[PDB]
């Protein structure tokens, strides 16, 4: 009963960031060595835990959230950050305990004519709470006049596509991101490293 991390990391397609995917991992033995012993990752930052200790630790549940963003947006997947992604698409808590892992996926998610399957939320009335997911497509009301589901002056569609192309600067290229959350509740631990 090993935890299925390869399903998350090696999935053929990833979610739009506004509709980020979440895999809930319970009741299993987790071998994180396949992660921290790999050299394919361009971002690997853990908060509240060192990755080299993960095989010796136990948690109530583990969460793996996955999505695609721009490379120059990966810095927003961190506690306390702001920006379009952190404010409107995927927000981490200040007291986050977990890892943020990102790799360049230009070879997979870019198209010469643009990949318009990947979207992000551009307009929102307020910032997202931590771990909140909003997939609504209501017309954004920029003013005080109700929009009645119609685009116009101060009435804007809230989603926008990345349109990923094989650009020359890596900061514009698409990056796949997995965020691992390690949950500790007042309950028996169900996800444990092989050493425990």
């Amino acid at each position, epitope marked *: 009963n090993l935890c299925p991390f390869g399903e998350v990391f090696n999935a053929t397609r990833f979610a739009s960031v506004y509709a980020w995917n979440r895999k809930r991992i319970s009741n299993c033995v987790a071998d994180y060595s396949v992660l921290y012993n790999s050299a394919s990752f361009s971002t690997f930052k853990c908060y509240g835990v060192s990755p080299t200790k993960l095989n010796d630790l136990c948690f109530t549940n583990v969460y793996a959230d996955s999505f695609v963003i721009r490379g120059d947006e990966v810095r927003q997947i961190a506690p306390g950050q702001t920006g379009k992604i952190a404010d409107y698409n995927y927000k981490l808590p200040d007291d986050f305990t977990g890892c943020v892992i990102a790799w360049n996926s230009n070879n997979l998610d870019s198209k010469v004519g643009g990949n318009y399957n990947y979207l992000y939320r*551009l307009f929102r*009335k307020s910032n997202l709470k931590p771990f909140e997911r909003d997939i609504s497509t209501e017309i954004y009301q*920029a003013g*005080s*006049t109700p929009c009645n589901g119609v685009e116009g*002056f*101060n009435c*804007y569609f809230p989603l*926008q596509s990345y349109g990923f192309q094989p650009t020359n600067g890596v900061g514009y290229q698409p990056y796949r991101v997995v965020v691992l959350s390690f949950e500790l509740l007042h309950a028996p631990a169900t996800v444990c490293g092989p050493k425990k």
Partner: antibody
Amino acid sequence: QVQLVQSGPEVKKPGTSVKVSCKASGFTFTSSAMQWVRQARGQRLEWIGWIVVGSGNTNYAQKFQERVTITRDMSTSTAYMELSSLRSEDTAVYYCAAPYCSSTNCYDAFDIWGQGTMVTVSS
Amino acid sequence: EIVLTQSPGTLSLSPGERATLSCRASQSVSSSYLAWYQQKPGQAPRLLIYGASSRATGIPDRFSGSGSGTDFTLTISRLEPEDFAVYYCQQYGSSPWTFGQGTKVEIKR
């Protein structure tokens, strides 16, 4: 100080293009929109078309549809209107306008106007 | 397109009188998407009324707006010599966002 500031007057030979700039200060540019209007000397105002700053979506009147391109550059908070295939009927004053926007709300009309840009097309 | 027709073409009144400007639309237009601008010579248009009844920021109380459907009215109650200008109505709820031809308010002397 909430303002829109346009570029100076322009002289263009017929058939060329003119690019008028409009720089915004004092409000949330990222949440706003900009409409471009032209006025002929002693004549009425003529709507050219508008752009949504955040998305860059544009909407032009059919008469200017094949000839005008409205863009924006958010690193400088400046929108631009380019008019191509210039004929003598384009000699006019060109205005940009935008609603004032805070971090949360936007004005429900075009209350900020630029000073205008006089463009003369002749040989 | 939506044609906005203003009335009258020109308007001569002495200071202190009340000026009534009409804007008529070829079809109905939402009240919250009609605006009144005042343009003085050598000057940019200035927003007078928005939403057909709301006064823009800093606009004097002598300026009033009303109307609905295909007929809107701008009223200048305490007409002043500085109010000589061209007044325009614009609809911006349906593309193209057409302007009226304008009404010229002039002062008698």
